[PDB]
Design an enzyme around this catalytic site. Structure first.
Site, mmCIF file in Angstrom:
data_model
loop_
_atom_site.group_PDB
_atom_site.id
_atom_site.type_symbol
_atom_site.label_atom_id
_atom_site.label_comp_id
_atom_site.label_asym_id
_atom_site.label_seq_id
_atom_site.Cartn_x
_atom_site.Cartn_y
_atom_site.Cartn_z
ATOM 1 N N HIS A 81 0.800 -1.228 0.000
ATOM 2 C CA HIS A 81 0.000 0.000 0.000
ATOM 3 C C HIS A 81 0.834 1.279 0.000
ATOM 4 O O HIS A 81 0.809 2.064 0.952
ATOM 5 C CB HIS A 81 -0.963 0.001 1.190
ATOM 6 C CG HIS A 81 -1.982 -1.093 1.143
ATOM 7 N ND1 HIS A 81 -1.781 -2.328 1.726
ATOM 8 C CD2 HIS A 81 -3.193 -1.155 0.540
ATOM 9 C CE1 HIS A 81 -2.823 -3.102 1.482
ATOM 10 N NE2 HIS A 81 -3.692 -2.414 0.764
ATOM 11 N N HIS A 85 1.255 1.839 -5.788
ATOM 12 C CA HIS A 85 -0.018 1.130 -5.837
ATOM 13 C C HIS A 85 -1.071 2.153 -6.273
ATOM 14 O O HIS A 85 -1.812 1.927 -7.224
ATOM 15 C CB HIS A 85 -0.393 0.564 -4.462
ATOM 16 C CG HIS A 85 -1.830 0.157 -4.349
ATOM 17 N ND1 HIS A 85 -2.428 -0.723 -5.226
ATOM 18 C CD2 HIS A 85 -2.791 0.516 -3.466
ATOM 19 C CE1 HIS A 85 -3.694 -0.889 -4.890
ATOM 20 N NE2 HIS A 85 -3.941 -0.148 -3.824
ATOM 21 N N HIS A 121 -7.038 7.108 -2.532
ATOM 22 C CA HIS A 121 -7.718 6.043 -1.797
ATOM 23 C C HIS A 121 -7.001 5.258 -0.707
ATOM 24 O O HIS A 121 -7.663 4.615 0.108
ATOM 25 C CB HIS A 121 -8.380 5.068 -2.775
ATOM 26 C CG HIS A 121 -7.503 3.927 -3.181
ATOM 27 N ND1 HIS A 121 -6.540 4.040 -4.160
ATOM 28 C CD2 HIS A 121 -7.434 2.655 -2.728
ATOM 29 C CE1 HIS A 121 -5.913 2.886 -4.291
ATOM 30 N NE2 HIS A 121 -6.436 2.028 -3.433
ATOM 31 N N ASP A 122 -5.670 5.294 -0.676
ATOM 32 C CA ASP A 122 -4.931 4.571 0.362
ATOM 33 C C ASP A 122 -3.952 5.471 1.123
ATOM 34 O O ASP A 122 -3.006 4.985 1.738
ATOM 35 C CB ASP A 122 -4.162 3.381 -0.235
ATOM 36 C CG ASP A 122 -4.983 2.102 -0.265
ATOM 37 O OD1 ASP A 122 -5.842 1.920 0.624
ATOM 38 O OD2 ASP A 122 -4.748 1.262 -1.153
ATOM 39 N N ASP A 233 -8.713 -0.935 -8.072
ATOM 40 C CA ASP A 233 -7.965 -1.358 -6.895
ATOM 41 C C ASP A 233 -7.329 -2.747 -7.036
ATOM 42 O O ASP A 233 -6.240 -2.993 -6.505
ATOM 43 C CB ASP A 233 -8.890 -1.300 -5.670
ATOM 44 C CG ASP A 233 -8.133 -1.270 -4.360
ATOM 45 O OD1 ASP A 233 -6.984 -0.792 -4.345
ATOM 46 O OD2 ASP A 233 -8.690 -1.715 -3.338
HETATM 47 MG MG LIG Z 1 -7.544 0.379 0.743
HETATM 48 ZN ZN LIG Z 2 -5.822 0.138 -2.653
#
Ligand SMILES: [Mg+2]
Ligand SMILES: [Zn+2]
Length: 338
Positions: A81, A85, A121-122, A233
Site C-alpha cells: 500500500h 499502488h 484512496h490509500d 484497486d
Molecule cells: Mg484500501
Molecule cells: Zn488500494
C-alpha cells in the site's frame, strides 16, 4: 527557503503529451509499475490532460502540480500500500476511460472524482487493516470504528487535509454546491474500497448487469462507480503472471507482518495472516474465485470490451493452480522470483 522550486521544475516544459510516454501507455497490456517512480507525477498530469479535466473544470496547473506532489508524499512505504499502488490504480482508471469509453456511461464530474479518488484512496496506509486498528485500539479506530471502514475513512480524511493545505486546493474556485458534490463523491468512492461494502452491494451489481446499465438511473451511477473503483484497486490481477506473482509477495509480506504483531499481542491471527499456516497459492486461488474473478465477470457483462480483463484474471488463476512452492508463508528471502 525555495518553496516553489519543486513544482516549478515539474511544470518547466509544460505537461508531457500522453502519447510521448509510451506508444502502449493506453493499452490494457501496459504495466504502469514499470514506469520510473520519479516520472509518475508528470504521468498523472498527462492523464488528467488527456481526459481533459484541467480544461473542463478550470483547474490551476501550479495548484494541481502541488496537489499531485502532496498526494505522492502522503503515502508511506509499506510493501504494497504505497504510492506506486495508488499510481497503478489511477492508471487503470485512465485505461477504463480510454478503452471502455466511460464518458458514455458516467457524468464527467463523476469520472474526475473517480480518478482523484484512485490517487488518494490509500493515503497514509501503514500496512495494517481495519481489524488490526480495532484490536490494537488505535487512535484511528477510536475515531471511526463506530461508522465502520476505519482505514477508508482515514484515507478520505487525509485527502481533505491535503486540499486544505496551503496552495493545494484544486477545487477552491468551485461553487459551494459543486465543491460539496466533489467531496461527497470522493468520500463514497473511497469508502467503496472496503471489501465489506463490495460484498453488500454485490447482488445489486448483478441485478444492474442483468437488466442492463441505464444512464438515466441515478442508482446505476452510484453502483457503477463502486464497481469501477474496486476494479481499479485489484487491477494488478489483470496483468501478466509476473505482476500477479510479485504483488502477492508484497501483500503477504504486509499480511504476515501484521500477523506477527497480533501474535505478540497474545492474540490468534487469521490463517492468511499467519506465516506458519498460510499457503499462498491456495489463498490466491480462493481470492481469485471468490473476489477477483466475479468482479471482472460483472465488468464484462456490462462492458463487452472488458472481456480480455476477465480472461487474464482467469488465466492467472490457472497459473496459481499449476503452482500449488510447497512451504507455508514466504521463503527466507521473502521472494517468489523462482
Ligand atoms: Mg484500501
Ligand atoms: Zn488500494
Amino acid at each position: 527557503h525555495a518553496s516553489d522550486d519543486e513544482y516549478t521544475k515539474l511544470l518547466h516544459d509544460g505537461i508531457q503529451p500522453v502519447a510521448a510516454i509510451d506508444s502502449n501507455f493506453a493499452s490494457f497490456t501496459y504495466t504502469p509499475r514499470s514506469l520510473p517512480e520519479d516520472d509518475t507525477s508528470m504521468a498523472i498530469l498527462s492523464m488528467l490532460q488527456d481526459m481533459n479535466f484541467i480544461n473542463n473544470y478550470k483547474i490551476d496547473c501550479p495548484t494541481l502540480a502541488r496537489f499531485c506532489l502532496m498526494v505522492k508524499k502522503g503515502y508511506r512505504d509499506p510493501p504494497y500500500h504505497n504510492w506506486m499502488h495508488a499510481f497503478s490504480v489511477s492508471h487503470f482508471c485512465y485505461l477504463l476511460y480510454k478503452n471502455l469509453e466511460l464518458t458514455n456511461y458516467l457524468e464527467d464530474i463523476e469520472i474526475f472524482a473517480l480518478f482523484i479518488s484512485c490517487m488518494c484512496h490509500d493515503l497514509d496506509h501503514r500496512g495494517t487493516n481495519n481489524s488490526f486498528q480495532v484490536a490494537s485500539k488505535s487512535v484511528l479506530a477510536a475515531l471511526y470504528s463506530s461508522e465502520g471502514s476505519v482505514m477508508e475513512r482515514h484515507h478520505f480524511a487525509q485527502a481533505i487535509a491535503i486540499l486544505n493545505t496551503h496552495g493545494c486546493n484544486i477545487f477552491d474556485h468551485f461553487s459551494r454546491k459543486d465543491y460539496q458534490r466533489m467531496l461527497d463523491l470522493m468520500r463514497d468512492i473511497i469508502l467503496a474500497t472496503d471489501l465489506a461494502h463490495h460484498l453488500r452491494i454485490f447482488k445489486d451489481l448483478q441485478k444492474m448487469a442483468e437488466v442492463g446499465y441505464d444512464r438515466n438511473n441515478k442508482q446505476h451511477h452510484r453502483l457503477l462507480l463502486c464497481l469501477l473503483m474496486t476494479s481499479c484497486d485489484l487491477s494488478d490481477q489483470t496483468k501478466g503472471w509476473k505482476t500477479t506473482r510479485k504483488i502477492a509477495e508484497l501483500i503477504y509480506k504486509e499480511f504476515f507482518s501484521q500477523g506477527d504483531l497480533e501474535k505478540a499481542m497474545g492474540n490468534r491471527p487469521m490463517e492468511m495472516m499467519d506465516r506458519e499456516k498460510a499457503y499462498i497459492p491456495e489463498l490466491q486461488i480462493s481470492f481469485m474465485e471468490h473476489i477477483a474473478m466475479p468482479i471482472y465477470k460483472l465488468l464484462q457483462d456490462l462492458f463487452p470490451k472488458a472481456a480480455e480483463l476477465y480472461e487474464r484474471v482467469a488465466s492467472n488463476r490457472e497459473h496459481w493452480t499449476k503452482v500449488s512452492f510447497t512451504i507455508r508463508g514466504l521463503p527466507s528471502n521473502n521472494s517468489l522470483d523462482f
